[PDB]
């Protein structure tokens, strides 16, 4: 659990470290992890005598480094109960000549079915019976990590298309704010497709409220450095 204190901007009197301008706070993260972060606006909102904070926050994740992926992600559709088949060979455009070690990591396998990887870039996904939703699984073609999303339909018409989850993400509604202690809690998820060494930036906009219902906006920044022990 990361725990950060906010710059209170009381007098903006914060002797910069002379050299060391960076004002965004560093956050290390590992591919696959899903960690929790708590930021304490108490230093900034406590002098502002009012009703504390409010849940009307906002976030944004602009990247800094990219290191574009090698393997592309893929999407498939099938009906309920019926077995699905798929390929894994046209998802890795290789510039050079080498072999293709198709592999499905057991840590990031399916969630509501089974996957039997064939001999050469083929696979059979048998979904769990009496089930209708979405499923994902992360393949590792020649070390490069990509994802495959499958949508199983309840045999009637069709299911919509998920947005192909990003490298670094913040869940939709898993955040919260405690106006009693001025503490904002949120989740930091790193998909297994993140490449080690990259750097992303997360900017948070938190609004406090006065005694009469007006707003006080505060903006902070964090540097998510994707590190990896492999």
């Amino acid at each position: 659990m990361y725990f950060f204190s906010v710059d209170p901007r009381n007098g903006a009197s914060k002797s910069g470290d002379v050299c060391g301008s960076c004002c965004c706070e560093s956050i290390s993260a590992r591919p696959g992890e899903v960690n929790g972060v708590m930021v304490s606006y108490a230093a900034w909102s406590a002098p502002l005598r009012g009703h504390g904070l409010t849940n009307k926050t906002t976030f944004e994740i602009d990247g800094v480094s990219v290191t574009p992926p090698k393997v592309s992600n893929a999407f498939g559709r099938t009906k309920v109960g019926v077995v699905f088949e798929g390929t894994l060979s046209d998802l890795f455009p290789n510039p050079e000549g080498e072999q293709v070690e198709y592999e499905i990591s057991e840590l990031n396998g399916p969630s509501n079915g089974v996957v039997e990887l064939g001999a050469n870039g083929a696979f059979t996904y048998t979904p769990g019976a009496l089930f209708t939703g979405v499923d994902r699984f992360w393949f590792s073609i020649n070390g490069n990590i990509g994802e495959y999303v499958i949508s199983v339909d309840p045999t009637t018409s069709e299911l919509p298309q998920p947005p192909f989850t990003t490298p670094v993400y913040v869940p939709a509604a898993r955040r919260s704010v405690d106006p009693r202690t001025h503490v904002l809690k949120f989740v930091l998820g790193v998909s297994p497709a993140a490449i080690p060494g990259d750097v992303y930036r997360l900017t948070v906009r938190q609004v406090a409220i006065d005694c009469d219902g007006n707003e006080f906006v505060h903006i902070s920044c964090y540097d998510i450095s994707i590190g990896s022990c492999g």
Partner: protein, 52 residues
């Protein structure tokens, strides 16, 4: 740092000129002018993001 056994054929014009040298001395490289070696550094320029 004088590479002894190279016996390079003496000439009157180098390869990398002053400009491109000065260029890839900021960028870490091991430019060699017999020929002697100087600026024996490694290809290290930047920690995680704070380049300097």
């Amino acid at each position: 740092g004088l590479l002894s056994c190279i016996n390079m054929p003496e000439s009157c014009t180098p390869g990398w000129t002053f400009g491109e040298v000065t260029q890839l001395q900021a960028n870490g490289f091991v430019v060699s002018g017999s020929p002697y070696i100087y600026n024996d550094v490694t290809n290290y320029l930047r920690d995680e993001k704070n380049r300097p």
